[PDB]
């Protein structure tokens, strides 16, 4: 008899399928930051990692496994083959001319998405890879999943950055500074000035010129500084990781724990704000065990509405010319 048999008496060997499994596809700076944030928040009983670079994939898995003593995630697996991702509740995609840069990530998705749906037909897909709004659509089209199970990170990072900048200007914690950046993720995002508040006190009600070019204090600059901070981080360190990883982990917690919290995420915006094309844009969504179960119908000004419609037309102009 072995030491294991001399020390431990086994009652049953009958192993079960993972109950709260998360898969992260792409183990770059974003993927690894999502991985550590998820592990530290104790959201999964199993974590699966996938990439094309075999050596860095094995190294990253081993480095996470060596930290098991300080974690509450008993199983960390990795592999090039998607059989390691079987029965995942949530799949996070962070793998990465502009129409050709869209097609560059599109042909990458032509392989990933069918391999993901094959082993986890009932999962929720969380898209992080850029252009997030186009690639969420691509993931939705290739998977054949209903709209609720295909979620784009969208304006989650934009809103988090906005609330941080809002907090700094008012000397208040970002948790107490409410503000929504919607529509197209990145440069063309829309700050919803009417909803910007502290303790239910509307900033536009107190300051009617809020976000307008004629505002003396220039509060519009809070949104400008979101765009500019993103370029600054890239210029200074070459990439963004911690902020995105923490925001993705926040989305994952709502999904995994079925919290039904409202988050600014990219969803099929068809039928809203005069949009008829199959486009994904950020609106506040209620997140839970079925993914996007509901969405908040935000009252937008004519100007905000026009910006959303223009973004939709631009995204459908690229999407129209895509090979599947």
């Amino acid at each position: 008899a072995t030491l294991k048999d001399q020390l431990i008496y086994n009652l049953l060997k009958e192993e079960q399928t993972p109950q709260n499994k998360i898969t992260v596809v792409g183990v770059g700076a974003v993927g690894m930051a999502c991985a550590i944030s998820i592990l530290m928040k104790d959201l999964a009983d199993e974590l699966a990692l996938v990439d094309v670079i075999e050596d860095k994939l094995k190294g990253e898995m081993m480095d996470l496994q060596h930290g098991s003593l300080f974690l509450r995630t008993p199983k960390i697996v990795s592999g090039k083959d998607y059989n390691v991702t079987a029965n995942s509740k949530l799949v996070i995609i962070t793998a990465g001319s502009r129409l050709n840069l869209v097609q560059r990530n599109v042909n990458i998705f032509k392989f990933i998405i069918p391999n993901v749906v094959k082993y986890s037909p009932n999962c929720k897909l969380l898209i992080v890879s850029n252009p997030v709004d186009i690639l969420t659509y691509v993931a939705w089209k290739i998977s054949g999943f209903p709209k609720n199970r295909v979620i784009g990170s969208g304006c989650n990072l934009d809103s988090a950055r906005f609330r941080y900048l809002m907090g700094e200007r008012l000397g208040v914690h970002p948790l107490s500074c409410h503000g929504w950046v919607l529509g197209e993720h990145g440069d063309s995002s829309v700050p919803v000035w009417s909803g910007m508040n502290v303790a239910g006190v509307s900033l536009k009600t107190l300051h009617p010129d809020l976000g307008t070019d004629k505002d003396k204090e220039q509060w519009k600059e809070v949104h400008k500084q979101v765009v500019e901070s993103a370029y600054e981080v890239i210029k200074l360190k070459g990439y963004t990781s911690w902020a995105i990883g923490l925001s993705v982990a926040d989305l994952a917690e709502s999904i995994m724990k079925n919290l039904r919290r409202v988050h600014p995420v990219s969803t099929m915006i068809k039928g809203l704000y005069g949009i008829k094309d199959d486009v994904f844009l950020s609106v506040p969504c209620i997140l839970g065990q079925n993914g996007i179960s509901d969405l908040v119908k935000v009252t937008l000004t004519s100007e905000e509405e026009a910006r959303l419609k223009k973004s939709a037309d631009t995204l459908w102009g690229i999407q129209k010319e895509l090979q599947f």
Copy 2:
């Protein structure tokens, strides 16, 4: 007249000193992994980051600040000047070249350590930079701090790796697999076979060949795999970050919360195991608000004791020829 003044009525604007401040010196792969693990564990009310590369430093600080909405650390500061580190309770040194490593790192410590003690004379110093055992001694000599306030990461990562491997062989969580790797961090570490247990059941008592060359089960391979895995991770991804960052955060928690938990850390071992020189080696230490307040006197075999004495002689041989 401002929106801030119209929205917020100020009661007082006297500034207080941070109560639970942590400083991380060196924002490389190790330093950043320590930062994120401390942030996600809510150990500090303020986090300061220091480095020589200004661009990378600003980028890393900004990336952490953009994630504030998902954290409970209201202040994140960075700078080349140590005035940003003022009144830190714990200072974590992860700087240097990732023996010539000794030479380069001593010279680097010659300037870091006096700048640290200048702004935080009452802090605890936690050394991560390699060779961790020599550099903990160097930090102790330059600072002039008492023994208890100078802590080396030492065999904390070695023991965590060992318990992970132990857990995998027995099908038990590493938290329930007890085992101590002591002495010199790295290649020359000592596994304490007599203390290896599950639920107080000694493994060497059940299996006398444990750790011997005549063991058919080859349990001696468990300690060799700790050494092998470290080289494998480096070969595969180029560095180690997550495992070390999580282990350092576990030490930080015991210090910050005054837990008085026992950890394998590098301390002044002069007066134990026939050692008469000023050398730092890993032994189980009680960690709290005063740093190392106490140490556990582990009963070692003649073989284990000889390995510790040999390590001490080698470390002193390098140390006695160093210039301060």
Copy 3:
């Protein structure tokens, strides 16, 4: 040599003053619920418990100490003497005397004022630099009492106030909309309890004002009867008392949320009772709930909420009633 000396080599035996100490005064249902919430949220390196009933006090301390293996608070102390509370960063007062049928509201206040005139001087004696968090009812009057007896600046005297009222309101709001209360924003202000004021204009989800979409929100003409959401806050409080005899978990969790902002210097906004003199036409030394920024100095700042004239009149009426009792208080 002892087993301890044979096993452990001591480097230094000197113990530092506690760094993040919390004291809970009154170990009744509320106090104990505040204690377990603070312990489970790891907000303190030291927890001190005080009461007048020595046996119950020792029992409660021992029961908490027996759970130390599952906690991250290395020291739990208790005692009748306030020397156990020395150097506390935050002192939570939950000591009180319940409502007795056949007494005036002034008489009820005075009995609790009698309880405080021993506690407050003993608290400031051992923790002159602490923050005082008052839970005992009538919370608005007793926060004033604590402020007057202590001699502390306004920022270091905090009343629980409308923190439980808002938490209850947001739960009920969440239920109606099928959304988590964290995402359902709403503020109940003024006097804690029966006379609280729901601020309809601030009620929102994702920055979308409910009053803007539905102008009859909080009006008696409302077809959807959203005004009954605030009435259910009042009703649920009486229902809980009728059903189990007291309230503990909800208040303990809300107090822990306040403690977290103070202990960690978060600067989060909370509806807490503060010295409202100089706002909403209130010219008296009264404590009412308004949204306050809470940190290491207690209330460092307050949010100037725009109120309708009827919300302002309700606040002024509450202030007059509280001052009417306060002026007749002997201490």
Copy 4:
């Protein structure tokens, strides 16, 4: 159109994934509830009792604290339909041979109602005499022994490690020690396993656990027994310590951690014990309940104490009607 419909556009209006049920909302039950809620172990918490008013009050009080919790649904009821598809069921209902039979009659109604709605659950028995009632739950349910867990010596060990920690000035997490066998007065401290950093205390101090010992380390176990009576005399019941220990068990089960805990299990087949009795041994706890057990090397004296406890428990068990 309602305000809800004007504000929120519904995509779909389509069961609990990590549900926990607590049976008996007394001091123990409520302490288990708050500990589980604060540890974020369940997405749904179901509460059951016979006293309808107290039950509704306790459920409401927990619901009013939702803003500070990460458990979106708290339900209660006299009917067990509220407990449907629970992953873990915690039984805390009961009196704080004649009395044992009255507690069997209570379990004759609870246990069939629990398995009816949660046939795949893990049963965690807290109610006293915990070792006898664990057997009772196992017999009535028909569940395999891995899915019937008794709290057993989990509180005894926690108390012991606290007392060990106080004597050595070390955190109980770093003070290892196992109290096994029968929960309560007749528990067995395993002196050979008592250690700090893998350093055996019995090796350094041979008199450890004997009357001869000048340092009287045997009092560490005797003060566990004494403290239990003291807490009862002082406050009338024990709640926080037991509630925190149950949440610790619940965490290893819910998250499939495979951590070792001192819990009551079917001990028949070990230490010459032939009768169907449940005693505490270190068990590996996970998603299947007790998947494995640690075979502790016990001295002749310790082994005899377990066998004697088994004979006493069987003596009571054989005379039971159910």
